Design a protein around this nucleic acid. Structure first.
Ligand SMILES: Nc1nc2c(ncn2[C@@H]2O[C@H](COP(=O)(O)OP(=O)(O)O)[C@@H](O)[C@H]2O)c(=O)[nH]1
Ligand SMILES: Nc1nc2c(ncn2[C@@H]2O[C@H](COP(=O)(O)OP(=O)(O)O)[C@@H](O)[C@H]2O)c(=O)[nH]1
Ligand SMILES: [K+]
Ligand SMILES: [Mg+2]
Ligand SMILES: [Mg+2]
Ligand SMILES: [Mg+2]
Ligand SMILES: [Zn+2]
Lengths: 230, 99, 131, 299, 136, 333, 244
RNA sequence: CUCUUAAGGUAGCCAAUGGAUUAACGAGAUUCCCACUGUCCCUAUCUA
């Protein structure tokens, strides 16, 4: 068969003789079936059924509201219309993180008798030109999978988020030791490259570096989120 | 195109014989074959085929055909006769002989 | 049943049959074909140095000569002296295809036998000359 | 050539695909883990979740990508026909969006397995697995429009007639209502509908017959209006591309009774206008409807 | 019973498990065949798949043409050394194990088969029967 | 664009006229015919006809994928992350064949402060001018040092040591520097380290995978050397034959080595082969193997020559340097 | 007079049946549909016989004969031989042959007047073929192919050889057989034509998968229809050029 | 102030040889091949 052969077949032969009646009775039985499913489905399927029922009812209410609203009834230039898009920090206080949580003891030796190496369990920024220290003298371990270079920065102005490279770690509120180790936890002040935002000072200089505050826990969600400090 | 020429010639040729002897080799068609009436599936009065016999008796895999029914013997009562095979450690078949 | 007989006469370690070797020796064409073989890489001695009686390849001509000077080869030669014992002999001893067996024996004694003997004589003297 | 592309598996939309893959993870991988177990066990549990979900999405995307035809590698007749039917630009952009989603899902799975190697507790490991699955879900949700387009394309392209561009072909062409479909019905057993109104036939129809122990195919085309190519529409583009590509015997049908709605002068103008199309193709003119009026008794 | 086989196949004693090497009885240039799989094989823990006469196997050529080598191809077993029962009333066996190269439809790659072919295999495979000079 | 609610009824870019349409379609058909002829020269003669008869190429042996394990690559990235200087060890017989271009790219992109140089080892296995030309052509890209590794009779040891002293003096801010040795298996990294130490401190063997973990060696108080397991970057153009002739696989685990013997005949000079093996007169690889086996007495039970054993020994001789061969350097400009 | 049928969905008609001018032999397998396909063309004009050879079904490949004789191999039981003798009239000679090459259908290709034989058949088997089948005997190959009975299909009117048979070989074989020869396939490209079809002077039966050009060539060479000689190669040249 | 790419056509100069790629030996560690087989498919049977 070719092209719309089922539609042509219906046009040339019709449907089954009980098609309309059977479809009509199925649609009439739908109300009983929906009630039976709501009371009989169990577990995950029941929870999904209730969730979908709530969403459908919300959608119907919005459609009714829009219909009745219809039945009742920035100052951009010409080339931008018809187009779419206190010195307190936002996190003055964050959860305290102890050294027991921050560091993991690494055991060394054949019988695991030595315990002087420590591994940082959080995400870090190691800076440019990082080379690992030789393994015999490496006390602090900052593994490469937990090293970050870029962050999602939200600008309070214009409400946009951009993926910006990290320039430095300015202040980790937990400790200056974590600051100098480059630990990126919630509330850490970082320096970010803001070159693609196109900022200019009052003197005509181009801004390409500013500060931001980390607003999430990268050890929990695998990424760095920060809000720009403006 | 000269590429598909040789094989076309080789497969389009018909080999022909030429004499080699004065012996007549003529096609042989039996008289009953040449007098046979053509079978018609859509015809009320046709020969009954063995598959029709099978379908009316048991169908395929249930009908048990008798292979002795077509025997051309001197006496037709001999058709359903069991041929003995062994007699006292001897095969009957290698003693069976005219005269 | 015993290990010696099992591992010597296992079916996968079978050797050529004596009636087949008798047929190999009966005709001159078979003798020449088995005497002059193409260089085969997978046979000992590159397919040369083949004793027809024992159906056996030797690595070298000196090996073939030392083999011909042996009781094993003479045993095989003695075995190939008589009628090659087909199934016809067993059938006739049972008393079946008697005329066929007797005709075969007459043909062996009249034609096939002496021709095989002459071929064996020529083959032995050729092996003596070349070895 | 493949010549026919009915064997493409069904393309689920974005929400349905999310349901299928995520519920497959919840069903086919174990769901019970305890905070009292070894951290190695907990990490392996959540790593298996992330990896299995990633593989499910990748297998769906691969089944999509392998099934659909390669528009630039098919015979040029099929390339032009599918371009007319489905808009080649949108076709390739949708398939490329699927390919990009596949790459992003693989990257997310690899990144979060590597992170999960350093998880210290059930809470952190669970948060990392939820982050990985949520990022996969975001990627899939961004595929909503291309998936719906591709599902429509798959359903339509599975029903296209199989046309061999290198076999023996009789092309049938002319104005609407001149008898093209009627002649195809007379010479083949194709079931093309015959009606007294313009453009009953909106796609190419194929029939077959045997002449001197050879299989011939005949192509009925939608009618052609006498317009320039710039104002020619896609329905006529089907016939134009068929005539341009298929080396054949083109049969141009003429009606002298003008019951097609067109005059004899217009039909001759159409012939002389489509004259450049049948170069190095055998051409015949069939004057249909001679039971009404014959060429003998013209003016 | 395999694709291309003609009808059903009754059980025969198995003689060729995976890892066996049989001779090549056709004239396609192969010398022996190494069995790596058996078509129609069942499944049971620790049990080796094995082939009998008239079975289709997947085999590689160990000795023969390099063109035939490094390729996995179907083969049909035409002789076996393991004794098997014929329903007429005799146990019988051949001197060697032997197979012939085929395609998945069971059509012969070579043009002739040297040596006898078991009746069971010949009756199961029509192309083997057509290429056979000796049928036991 | 398409569907129940589609509004496109015309082509976006119509042909200018029917003459343009027919000419473009004729050119497209001719290009398609030529392209299909070109792919029928190879692919239909190969892969497509194998499915018709049901033939399949045998499985790729797991031995040819050695040097590509996650453990080895974890070790490699660890040594790179620890190294201030990275030495890429190349075989003087086939340096471009033994180059790790992907790792060079990654180092130039992600770690530009690490200094990457070339050491061309096994320079005693090629003629003098071949080594000179290879040093000249590789120096256009990176600093290259020709080398012969040996504890007692080496070449280039003083040059390499004074170069590492210059690197240390440049990084006087660091209290010590680390030099990591990377490259293909069996190119001689452990040998070079042993040569610099004048002591057998790293295990050396012709079998691939002799070095399995990294190893620190103190050369001077301010210079450390890091031995690394060999790596083989995956590629699609490189075949199992190329991998085998680069000395990467264990020949004793390959299935049929007689099929790789013709590559030996292609890569080696005939007079050199006949001087190495005291034979002559072969016209093909199988004849060469048979003659060598009969000379050596490598016969099996029954007089068949041991083709596989002789082929494995030949492949070992080629890789271990008992047969002279080299790849010509690029032409002088 | 070329018909198409299958034996239990097999296109190998010549494997499972034997057709001469005066009798037809069929395998016993399953229903009576194969027998009835032959009976629809032959009626009661010649005997159509159900038979087994060594308890097998491959009877066209196990036996050879013509309108005067029928040769069965040494594996035939006394009971099968007796059943064949009871079914056929005395005008057909029936002989059991002691030959090593027991696939007589594969190793003998014959008609009422001549026979091609495998080059290694016995002298006694050749004399028996000459005496019982009543034909001249020639030791031959079809372009290097032994198994002439499976790689050639022959009648008194014409012959079909496998399509890789050269022109010179065709000419020499046609002179030996004194019938016109053509090269072709059967059953949609099969080269084993003798095992693919059966034919006599007034009937040919091939598999269902035989294409219309192959069937037209078969009818032409065997002169099956009333006005269809072997000289319509010129009339079918266009179809054969398009097909080949 | 200066430093490295001058070396060229399948084996060179320079001092038989240019070597630890060391023969032999070894209840030393390791890989593979032939032969061989109840290690196994898949277990059966006999003696004390
Ligand atoms: N009198 C007459 N009318 C015809 C003939 N062929 C077609 N028609 C009529 O013409 C109308 C359109 O024919 P159709 O096959 O749809 O032409 P198409 O539009 O070119 O495919 C139908 O209503 C037919 O009844 C013919 O040969 N004679
Ligand atoms: N002739 C020669 N052989 C060498 C040289 N360097 C190394 N080899 C040999 O090549 C083989 C592999 O050496 P190895 O140090 O283990 O290479 P690795 O895998 O990179 O560590 C050893 O047998 C060495 O003796 C050299 O400069 N010349
Ligand atoms: K090594
Ligand atoms: Mg129409
Ligand atoms: Mg097991
Ligand atoms: Mg090493
Ligand atoms: Zn002897």
């Amino acid at each position: 068969p070719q092209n719309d052969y089922i539609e042509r077949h219906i046009k040339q032969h019709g449907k089954r003789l009980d098609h309309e009646e059977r479809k009509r009775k199925r649609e009439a039985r739908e109300s009983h079936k929906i009630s039976e499913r709501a009371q009989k489905l169990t577990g995950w399927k029941g929870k999904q059924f209730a969730k979908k029922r709530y969403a459908e009812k919300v959608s119907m209410r919005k459609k009714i509201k829009a219909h009745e609203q219809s039945k009742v009834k920035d100052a951009l230039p010409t080339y931008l219309l018809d187009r779419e898009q206190k010195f307190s920090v936002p996190l003055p206080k964050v959860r305290g993180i102890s050294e027991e949580e921050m560091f993991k003891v690494i055991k060394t030796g054949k019988s695991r008798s030595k315990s002087w190496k420590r591994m940082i369990t959080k995400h870090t920024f190691v800076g440019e030109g990082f080379t690992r220290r030789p393994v015999k003298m490496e006390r602090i371990i900052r593994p490469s999978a937990l090293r970050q270079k870029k962050a999602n920065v939200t600008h309070p102005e214009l409400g946009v988020t951009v993926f910006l490279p990290i320039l430095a770690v300015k202040k980790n509120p937990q400790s200056p030791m974590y600051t100098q180790l480059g630990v990126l936890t919630k509330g850490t002040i970082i320096e970010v490259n803001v070159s693609e935002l196109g900022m200019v000072t009052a003197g005509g200089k181009v801004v390409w570096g500013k500060y931001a505050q980390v607003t999430n826990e990268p050890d929990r969600d695998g990424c760095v989120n920060a809000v720009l400090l403006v | 195109s000269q590429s598909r020429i040789n094989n076309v010639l080789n497969k389009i040729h018909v080999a022909q014989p030429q004499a080699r002897d004065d012996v007549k080799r003529t096609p042989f068609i039996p008289e009953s074959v040449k007098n046979l009436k053509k079978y018609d599936p859509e015809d009320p009065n046709r020969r009954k085929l063995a598959r029709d016999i099978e379908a009316e008796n048991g169908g395929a895999g249930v009908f048990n055909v008798n292979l002795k029914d077509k025997y051309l013997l001197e006496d037709d009562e001999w058709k359903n006769d069991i041929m003995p095979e062994i007699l006292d450690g001897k095969n009957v078949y290698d003693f069976l002989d005219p005269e | 049943m015993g290990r010696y007989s099992v591992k010597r006469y296992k079916t996968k370690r079978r050797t050529r049959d004596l009636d087949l070797i008798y047929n190999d020796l009966s005709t001159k064409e078979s003798v020449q074909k088995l005497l002059n073989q193409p260089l085969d890489e997978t046979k000992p001695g590159l397919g040369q140095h083949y004793c027809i009686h024992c159906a056996k390849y030797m690595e070298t001509a000196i090996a073939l000569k030392t083999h011909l000077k042996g009781k094993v080869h003479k045993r095989r030669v003695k075995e190939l002296r008589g009628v090659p014992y087909t199934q016809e002999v067993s059938d006739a001893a049972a008393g079946y295809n008697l005329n066929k067996f007797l005709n075969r024996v007459q043909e062996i004694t009249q034609s096939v036998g002496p021709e095989k003997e002459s071929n064996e004589a020529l083959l032995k003297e050729h092996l003596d000359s070349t070895l | 050539m493949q010549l026919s592309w009915k064997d493409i598996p069904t393309v689920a939309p974005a929400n349905d695909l999310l349901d299928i893959v995520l519920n497959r993870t919840q069903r086919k991988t174990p769901t019970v883990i305890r905070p009292g177990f070894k951290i190695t066990r907990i990490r392996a549990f959540y790593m298996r979740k992330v990896k299995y979900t990633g593989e499910g999405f990748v297998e769906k995307f691969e089944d999509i990508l392998k099934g659909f035809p390669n528009i630039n590698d098919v015979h040029p007749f099929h390339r032009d026909l599918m371009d007319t039917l489905y808009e080649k630009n949108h076709y390739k952009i949708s398939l490329a969006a699927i390919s990009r989603a596949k790459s992003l899902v693989e990257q997310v799975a690899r990144d979060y397995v590597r992170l999960l190697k350093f998880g210290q507790s059930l809470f952190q490991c669970k948060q990392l697995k939820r982050a990985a699955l949520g990022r996969m879900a975001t990627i899939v949700k961004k595929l909503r429009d291309p998936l719906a387009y591709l599902e429509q394309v798959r359903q339509h392209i599975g029903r296209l007639p199989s046309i061999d561009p290198n076999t023996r072909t009789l092309l049938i062409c002319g104005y609407p209502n001149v008898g093209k479909s009627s002649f195809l019905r007379c010479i083949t057993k194709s079931d093309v509908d015959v009606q007294p109104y313009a453009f009953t036939t909106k796609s190419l129809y194929v029939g077959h017959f045997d002449y001197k122990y050879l299989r011939f195919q005949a192509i009925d085309t939608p009618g052609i209006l006498d317009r320039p190519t710039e104002e020619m529409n896609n329905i006529e583009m089907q016939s134009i591309y068929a005539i341009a590509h298929l080396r054949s015997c083109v049969l141009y049908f003429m009606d002298l009774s003008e019951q097609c709605g067109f005059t004899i002068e217009a039909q001759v103008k159409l012939f002389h206008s489509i004259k450049p199309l049948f170069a190095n193709k055998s051409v015949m003119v069939v004057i249909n409807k001679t039971d009404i009026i014959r060429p003998e008794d013209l003016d | 019973s395999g694709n291309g086989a003609q009808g059903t196949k009754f059980r025969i004693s198995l003689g060729l498990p995976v890892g066996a090497i049989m001779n090549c009885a056709d004239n396609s240039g192969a010398r022996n065949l190494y069995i790596i799989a058996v078509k129609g094989s069942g499944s049971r823990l620790n049990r080796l798949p094995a082939a009998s006469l008239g079975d289709m196997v997947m085999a590689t050529v160990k000795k023969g043409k390099p063109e035939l080598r490094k390729k996995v191809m179907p083969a049909i077993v035409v002789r076996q050394a393991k004794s098997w029962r014929r329903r007429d009333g005799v146990f019988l066996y051949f001197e060697d194990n032997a197979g012939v190269i085929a395609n998945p439809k069971g059509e012969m790659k070579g043009s002739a088969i040297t040596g006898p072919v078991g009746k069971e295999c010949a009756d199961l495979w029509p192309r083997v029967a057509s290429n056979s000079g000796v049928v036991v | 664009a398409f569907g129940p609610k589609a509004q496109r009824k015309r082509p976006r870019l119509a042909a200018s006229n029917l003459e343009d349409l027919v000419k473009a379609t004729n050119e497209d058909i001719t290009k398609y015919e030529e392209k299909q002829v070109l792919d029928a020269t190879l692919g239909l003669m190969g892969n497509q006809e194998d499915k018709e008869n049901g033939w399949t190429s045998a499985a790729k042996e797991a031995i040819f994928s050695k040097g590509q394990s996650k453990r080895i690559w974890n070790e490699l990235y660890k040594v790179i992350d620890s190294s201030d200087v990275v030495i890429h060890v190349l075989d003087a017989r086939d340096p471009l064949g033994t180059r790790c271009k992907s790792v060079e790219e990654y180092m130039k992109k992600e770690t530009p402060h690490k200094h990457l140089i070339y050491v061309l080892n096994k320079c005693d296995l090629v003629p003098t001018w071949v080594a000179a030309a290879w040093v000249k052509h590789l120096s256009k890209e990176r600093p290259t040092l020709a080398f012969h590794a040996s504890i007692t009779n080496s070449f280039g040891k003083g040059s390499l040591i004074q170069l590492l002293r210059q690197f240390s003096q440049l990084h006087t801010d660091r209290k010590q520097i680390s030099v990591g040795f990377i490259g293909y298996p069996n190119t001689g990294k452990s040998s070079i380290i042993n040569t610099l130490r004048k002591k057998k401190v790293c295990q050396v063997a012709p079998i691939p995978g002799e070095t399995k973990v990294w190893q620190y060696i103190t050369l001077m108080k301010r210079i450390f050397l890091i031995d690394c397991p060999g790596i083989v970057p995956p590629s699609s153009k490189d075949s199992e034959e190329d991998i085998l002739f680069r000395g990467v696989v264990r020949v004793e685990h390959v299935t049929h080595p007689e099929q790789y013997i013709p590559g030996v005949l292609k890569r080696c000079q005939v007079k050199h082969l006949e001087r190495t093996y005291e034979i002559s007169g072969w016209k093909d690889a199988t004849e060469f193997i048979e003659i060598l086996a009969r000379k050596q007495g490598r016969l099996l039970k029954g007089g068949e020559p041991d083709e596989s054993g002789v082929s494995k020994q030949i492949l070992n001789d080629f890789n271990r340097g008992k047969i002279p061969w080299f790849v010509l350097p690029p032409e002088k400009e | 007079m070329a018909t198409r049928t299958q034996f239990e969905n097999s296109n190998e008609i010549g494997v499972f049946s034997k057709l001469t001018n005066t009798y037809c032999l069929v395998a016993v397998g399953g229903s009576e549909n194969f027998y009835s396909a032959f009976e629809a063309e032959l009626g009661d004009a010649i005997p159509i016989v159900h038979t087994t050879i060594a308890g097998t079904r491959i009877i066209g490949r196990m036996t050879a004969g013509n309108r005067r004789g029928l040769l069965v191999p040494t594996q035939t039981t006394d009971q099968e031989l007796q059943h064949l003798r009871n079914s056929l009239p005395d005008s057909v000679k029936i002989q059991r042959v002691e030959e090593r090459l027991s696939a007589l259908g594969n190793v003998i290709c014959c008609n009422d007047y001549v026979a091609l034989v495998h080059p290694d058949i016995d002298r006694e088997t050749e004399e028996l073929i000459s005496d019982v089948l009543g034909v001249e005997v020639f030791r031959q190959t079809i372009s290097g192919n032994i198994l002439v009975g499976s790689y050639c299909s022959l009648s008194n009117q014409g012959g079909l050889v496998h399509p890789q048979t050269s022109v010179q070989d065709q000419e020499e074989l046609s002179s030996l057989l004194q019938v016109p020869l053509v090269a072709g396939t059967v059953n949609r490209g099969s080269s084993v034509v003798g095992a693919g079809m059966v034919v006599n002077d007034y009937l040919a039966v091939t598999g269902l998968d035989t294409t219309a050009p192959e069937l037209s060539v078969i009818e032409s060479i065997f002169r099956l229809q009333d006005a269809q000689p072997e000289s319509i190669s010129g009339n079918l040249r266009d179809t054969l050029i398009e097909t080949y």
